[model samples]
Target: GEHSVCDSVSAWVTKTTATDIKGNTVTVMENVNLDNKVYKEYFFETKCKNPNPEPSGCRGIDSSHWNSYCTETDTFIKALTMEGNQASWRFIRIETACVCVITKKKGN
Candidate 1:
């Protein structure tokens, strides 16, 4: 994971890897920002029999809001893959959150 400090926000980038039921390796990349709140973006790449299965899966970049006492809106991804063989399936799940601060410079 790589961490960087901005004017008022801190950012971090990390890579995550996992194994599926079929014994296939799945890798994901995530980026997070922290300041007054938490915001994040996530990316995942993997191979499976069925990339999308029941219960729609998600992957991409999203935002969330977090405070000193509470946190909300964490981004996530859900994917399913099925390979040859009876009742053989694999699922990939990925989630991420980033911290952010609203500056007065931006017109709200």
Candidate 2:
């Protein structure tokens, strides 16, 4: 097969046969070969502060991101979560926030 980072979409890729940006393998994840596809939407993990109760794996979301992707089963639930998130985000980010809006790859 071919060995190159030359693709139409960005993804977590690593070089197998070579080094640097020219990784030959993108199929390896758990090994010493890994790279973040910052050019695409990515998820992350976080925990609550040391004193408060919180869900174990609270999926962190940017304010705008929450507005974009957050969905509920119906109108009632939608009214509950969406507005609360918007309020929090607006109040918190009345100063500054950097949202790296990027396009996902075709297959994604």
Candidate 3:
């Protein structure tokens, strides 16, 4: 139950909302709810750089694209990011069941 994936076809969720880094907010994503859709699901991935393909970054290129379903909610759940020491962090879909109140605050 440490790290895993989620498939909420039969799982559970509770709709809600989320805020971003720009003092802005998103209406309905997947994370706007009580995310117990699955158990032990952690996201930490992203599209390969050298962005050459259509489905290269966050979303897909066209219809019928398979963007993994995740309950991360936050932008950085697992991939490699710049946090503490040229550190690493990232995530895939981020269809979290809910959002974080202190989600985005920018700079100290």
Candidate 4:
């Protein structure tokens, strides 16, 4: 796993490993892994200040004044040999931040 350090502050990659019900180990890699399953959830951690915050606001918001928060994103993969039975999962969590802003609906 690596974090991209440039204009925007975010994570680029995450690597991990897990075992299946059949006792088979699987390395969670980008190209080597098989049967990709992606799951995402939101968290209110203040890790967005790590190194630095994203200078630009998200979703067309103003960076001049805004709040940022982090979320834990998980990625699960199935075993190579056995698909169904091998249901082990190692959640490769990558913490990412997003800008907080408010908006209104069109005459709702």
Candidate 5:
């Protein structure tokens, strides 16, 4: 019999904050498939200080580099079959923190 999916598949991630910004951080994650071969999926999430005031929304960053801003929406997924056997899938998750900036006025 053949297995439908790999059992050793898993994921790991980390995050860091920016010193320049008071409360700005970035998170990254990766999913790995370990079934006598390499197979995996990757996902990402981000939170940032919204430039708008009334209604705010988090800004998305580039998957490749969390520090980079995402100009457009993107998605990625991967599937693999080992030794002509059944197919397997892996998933990766990513996320980010929020950033808020404050400026000083001429007079207090």
Candidate 6:
């Protein structure tokens, strides 16, 4: 059976709140997977002060660094939040239990 080496320990995550441009707030849900790993332990949140200057999106920073059990097979989840007229994004980590795909047999 082709499986992933995902016997690693569970990564703990906390829920966060994001503010929308319309003066509304939303809760960010926790993420999970079967690989026993997440994208990263933590990420840097860069804030924009100007409104309508550009589209709100997540991006990488040269100073970004953190501990991670995630491999290339793992994927990162994107989150967007508007701060008043400005905007910011976060890369949430999604841990999993298993990594590889398992094929099932048709015959019993």
lDDT of each: 0.32, 0.20, 0.30, 0.37, 0.28, 0.36
What TM value does model 2 have? 0.13
> Which candidate tops lDDT?
4
Provide C-alpha RMSD values for all models, in order.
18.9, 24.2, 17.9, 11.8, 18.0, 19.4
Q: Which digits, one per residue and each the tens of the lDDT, describe model 1 over residues 1-108?
A: 643111111234334554454456654323333476644443432222232221221212122322111112233343323333222223544323322223232222
Could you give candidate 3's per-residue lDDT for residues 21-58 as a string of tens digits? 43333332332223556333333323222222233222
Clashing pairs in 1: 33-99, 37-100, 38-98, 38-99, 39-98, 39-99, 40-98, 49-82, 50-81, 50-82
Q: Highest TM-score: which candidate? A: 5
Candidate 4: worst 10 consecutive residues by lDDT?
A: 40-49
Minimum summed lDDT over a 10-residue window in model 5 is located at 15-24
Location of the lowest summed lDDT over 10 successive residues in candidate 6: 54-63
Sort every candidate by lDDT, greatest first: 4, 6, 1, 3, 5, 2
Per-candidate clash tally: 10, 1, 16, 0, 2, 10
**TM per prediction:** 0.19, 0.13, 0.17, 0.23, 0.26, 0.21
Stretches of candidate 2 above 4 Å error? 1-8, 20-30, 33-108
For residue 96, model 1's alpha carbon misses the true position, in angstroms, by 17
Q: Could you give candidate 4's per-residue lDDT for residues 22-93 as a string of tens digits?
A: 444555443333358544322222224432235442333443454333333333333223234553344333
* Better model by lDDT: candidate 4 vs candidate 5: 4
Q: Which stretches of candidate 1 lie over 4 Å from their true place?
A: 1-15, 31-90, 93-108
lDDT of 6 at 33: 35
TM-score winner between 1 and 2, please give it: 1
What are the runs in model 3 whose C-alpha is more than 4 Å off?
Answer: 1-15, 31-108
